[PDB]
Amino acid sequence: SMEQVAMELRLTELTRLLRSVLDQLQDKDPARIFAQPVSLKEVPDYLDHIKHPMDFATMRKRLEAQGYKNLHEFEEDFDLIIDNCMKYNARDTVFYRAAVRLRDQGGVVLRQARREVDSIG
């Protein structure tokens, strides 16, 4: 149908906007602490601590399969990245501190993205 196509153009455009959002958030992580999944070879107990792992490469795979239906779902995944780190790592670690900084800096980007998603529909 013509509607399904219209729907698919909006998903594609949302994907377009979320790709730009993802690139902006990932620039706030110059150390690349959040770039890839925590290694289960290097942290074999990780899943005993963290039940839903997340990282920027995994978000990117979901993104490119148009797997985010709305901004809320995308934010949920970003928030997992931050929250998993803040639980697994202690407060006095470069990891925890990197997550705090990513959260603080990402807030600005996410604030405007919500306005853009509401605005452009």
Domain tally for the chain? Answer: 1
Q: How far apart are the C-alpha atoms of 66 and 49, rounded to whole Å?
A: 29
The three-point CA angle 61-65-67 to 5° equals 90
Place of tokens 């405007």: 112
Q: How far apart are the C-alpha atoms of 3 and 106, rounded to whole Å?
A: 34
Q: Which experimental method was this entry solved with? A: X-ray
The three-point CA angle 89-85-18 to 5° equals 165
Resolution given for this structure, in angstroms: 1.7
Q: Which two tokens stand for residue 79?
A: 């928030």
Three-state DSSP at 51 gives coil
Tell me the residue type at 21.
V
Place of tokens 């070879």: 41
DSSP string, 11-49: HHHHHHHHHHHHHHHHHT-TT-SSSSPPPTTTSTTHHHH
Expressed as residue numbers, the domain containing 26 is: 1-121
Which CATH number does the domain housing residue 100 bear? Answer: 1.20.920.10
Three-state DSSP at 94 gives helix
Q: What is the CA radius of gyration of the chain?
A: 16
Report which DSSP code applies to 115: H
CA within 13 Å, CB half, 39: 3
3-state secondary structure 64-87: HCCCCCCHHHHHHHHHHHHHHHHH
Phi, psi of 34 (to 5 degrees): -110, 10
